[PDB]
């Protein structure tokens, strides 16, 4: 499998949803053990999923995930301690809408990280400590975290995670940092936090790619730039969106562009071979680049195992039929998978 083909290069990972991590599906258990040597929880360790609005914890799924990784001796990545998404507004706000104090929020962060990173200390090899702190306008993201705490929200999260599990490989993770602009903004942020003494070991590039964009040359500049910070580079959430893109439509469509329309969902009956070919070539191009820079890269994780489970079926448009991953809806390897193997088989 892939994990073996790529053994001398980097870990090969997959995000697992709660149904898969339950271990009920023997077909998937077999596939995962063959193909992947790292796993990430797709949702179950996110603050708002693990805890309710009153802060109460329910460990069923997160424990199942860690049990699965332990059973199969898989490298496990915690995802994610501090993030602005999938987190209750109650963490940040009084019921009247007003923000709580920086001190009150610090206490919550302290409890959350001490509890969550503590429970799995030594079991999870790595943590996404902070996710998506740079906004797409290249300023710091204007989240409640940042508005209340300033950049201490980042500094404190890493410091805390490091005190709780000193052996964990701590990462900052983000999307679109493959691209000029956000790349350099991220470098500058991390640089200044590093000079402040923040513990950080790795840099996660999500790798939510389109079938065409961004180009290999852009991703290459990112691998190089982030490695220069003395950080290990991980590709954390790989997928390739093969469906009509609505990201850059004219202003008249700004609000309607996320609506379902049949023309935006052209492959409900299957992905035609010509698109399989393009998808395979795109993955081949990407993994050629990763191999080239294997000295800088610790891991390539896919954001799912097979196409049926991909979040891209419902994002950014609900109810589409996307084909972003290496295994199809019948758990069979797609052409892309064989191209990835051949890169290694043939030297
Ligand atoms: O919650 C997080 C999500 O918000 C995040 O969504 C990402 C948002 O940005 C997306 O990147 C888009 C990709 O499309 C680009 O424009 C295309 C350029 O090529 C043209 O051929 C095409 O017509 C355009 O539409 C756009 O510049 C770029 O910003 C990214 O894919 C999403 O994943 O994902 C992470 C979540 O946690
Ligand atoms: O409506 C909710 C869904 O929107 C939710 O979907 C999950 C959203 O998060 C995705 O993972 C992120 C993908 O992008 C980046 O890589 C992030 O780092 C990831 O965390 C999941 O894949 C989706 O399943 O699920 C809950 C539902 O209530
Ligand atoms: Mg272990």
């Amino acid at each position: 499998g892939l994990k073996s083909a790529y053994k001398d290069n980097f870990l090969i990972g997959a995000a697992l949803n709660a149904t898969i991590a339950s271990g009920a599906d023997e077909r998937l258990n077999t596939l995962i053990a063959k193909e992947f040597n790292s796993i990430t929880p797709e949702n179950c360790m996110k603050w708002g999923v693990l805890r309710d609005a009153q802060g109460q914890w329910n460990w069923k799924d997160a424990d199942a995930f860690v049990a699965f990784g332990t059973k199969h001796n898989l490298h496990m990545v915690g995802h994610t301690l501090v993030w602005h998404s999938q987190i209750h507004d109650e963490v940040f706000k009084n019921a009247d809408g007003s923000y709580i104090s920086k001190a009150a929020l610090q206490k919550k962060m302290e409890e959350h990280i001490t509890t969550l990173a503590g429970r799995y200390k030594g079991k999870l090899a790595a943590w996404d400590v902070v996710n998506e702190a740079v906004g797409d306008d290249l300023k710091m993201r204007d989240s409640h975290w940042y508005k209340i705490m300033g950049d201490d929200f980042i500094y404190n999260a890493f410091t805390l995670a490091n005190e709780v599990d000193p052996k964990a490989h701590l990462m900052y993770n983000d999307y679109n940092i493959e691209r000029t602009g956000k790349r350099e903004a991220t470098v500058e942020m991390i640089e200044r936090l590093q000079k402040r003494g923040m513990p950080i070991h790795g840099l996660g590039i999500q790798g939510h790619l389109g079938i065409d964009t961004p180009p290999i040359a852009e991703i290459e500049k990112s691998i190089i730039a982030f490695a220069k910070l003395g950080l290990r580079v991980h590709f954390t959430s790989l997928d390739v969106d093969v469906l009509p893109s609505v990201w850059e439509l004219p202003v008249a469509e700004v609000s309607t562009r996320f609506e379902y329309k049949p023309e935006r969902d052209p492959y409900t009956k299957g992905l035609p071979q010509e698109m399989q070919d393009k998808l395979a070539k795109r993955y081949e191009d990407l993994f050629k680049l990763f191999i080239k820079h294997s000295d800088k890269i610790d891991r390539a994780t896919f954001w799912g195992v097979s196409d049926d489970a991909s979040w891209l079926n419902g994002f950014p448009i609900p109810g589409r039929t996307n084909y972003p991953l290496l295994f199809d809806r019948k758990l069979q390897p797609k052409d892309a998978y064989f191209r990835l193997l051949d890169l290694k088989r043939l030297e």
Side-chain angles (χ1 to χ4, degrees), residues 257-294:
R257 58 179 173 157
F258 301 118
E259 299 302 285
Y260 184 93
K261 304 168 94 255
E263 324 82 64
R264 296 169 176 177
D265 192 25
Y267 306 125
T268 58
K269 291 195 175 292
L271 186 67
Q273 184 63 52
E274 57 97 354
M275 288 294 323
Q276 295 283 356
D277 291 341
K278 282 186 32 87
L279 175 60
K281 178 47 168 50
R282 179 58 157 157
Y283 268 121
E284 182 187 71
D285 286 345
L286 181 76
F287 273 69
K288 282 168 53 169
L289 177 68
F290 295 172
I291 290 166
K292 180 187 179 183
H293 293 285
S294 70

Side-chain angles (χ1 to χ4, degrees), residues 16-152:
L16 307 189
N17 67 47
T19 300
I20 298 176
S22 77
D25 183 336
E26 96 91 44
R27 198 171 172 205
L28 267 173
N29 300 341
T30 290
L31 186 164
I32 290 163
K34 175 184 172 187
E35 298 294 346
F36 304 107
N37 53 12
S38 179
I39 53 168
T40 303
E42 192 172 355
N43 289 294
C44 71
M45 297 189 190
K46 295 168 179 180
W47 190 313
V49 179
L50 184 60
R51 304 177 67 185
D52 72 18
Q54 287 183 290
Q56 300 161 329
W57 305 69
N58 185 335
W59 291 106
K60 179 178 184 302
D61 292 325
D63 278 357
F65 175 90
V66 177
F68 185 93
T70 295
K71 168 176 175 185
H72 298 285
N73 191 21
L74 301 168
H75 170 271
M76 289 178 276
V77 178
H79 176 72
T80 161
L81 296 172
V82 175
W83 188 33
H84 69 283
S85 197
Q86 292 176 267
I87 182 171
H88 305 287
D89 277 359
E90 291 83 348
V91 170
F92 309 100
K93 291 178 169 193
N94 301 313
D96 65 11
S98 60
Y99 284 142
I100 70 174
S101 68
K102 184 177 173 177
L105 188 53
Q106 169 74 26
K107 191 164 194 73
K108 294 190 187 179
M109 183 189 288
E110 285 171 353
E111 166 179 64
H112 190 73
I113 293 174
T114 296
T115 299
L116 173 50
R119 190 185 183 88
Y120 302 133
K121 178 214 71 210
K123 308 191 185 195
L124 298 177
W127 266 105
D128 287 343
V129 175
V130 173
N131 211 30
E132 298 180 6
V134 173
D136 288 303
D137 70 346
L138 315 188
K139 299 205 167 298
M140 295 297 298
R141 180 180 291 281
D142 69 327
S143 58
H144 309 317
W145 284 117
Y146 184 71
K147 282 183 132 167
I148 297 171
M149 302 191 70
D151 72 2
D152 280 356

Side-chain angles (χ1 to χ4, degrees), residues 83-85 131-132 136 141 175-176 179 206 208-210 212-213 239 241 245-249 311-312 315:
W83 188 33
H84 69 283
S85 197
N131 211 30
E132 298 180 6
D136 288 303
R141 180 180 291 281
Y175 68 89
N176 280 352
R179 291 160 184 277
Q206 287 182 18
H208 288 305
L209 308 177
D212 299 303
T213 57
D239 48 33
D241 190 340
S245 181
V246 301
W247 294 116
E248 297 190 339
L249 295 179
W311 74 304
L312 296 183
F315 179 85

Side-chain angles (χ1 to χ4, degrees), residues 185-241:
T186 300
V187 167
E188 176 53 37
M189 183 186 72
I190 295 299
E191 272 184 329
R192 302 303 193 191
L193 289 166
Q194 284 175 305
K195 55 158 61 280
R196 209 174 144 184
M198 192 182 77
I200 174 168
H201 308 110
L203 191 288
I205 300 173
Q206 287 182 18
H208 288 305
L209 308 177
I211 180 61
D212 299 303
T213 57
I216 292 292
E218 278 279 80
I219 303 166
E220 186 160 23
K221 283 177 185 65
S222 295
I223 294 165
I224 292 166
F226 292 128
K228 280 177 191 166
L229 300 183
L231 297 176
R232 305 307 301 161
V233 178
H234 306 235
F235 283 82
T236 69
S237 322
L238 294 165
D239 48 33
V240 176
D241 190 340

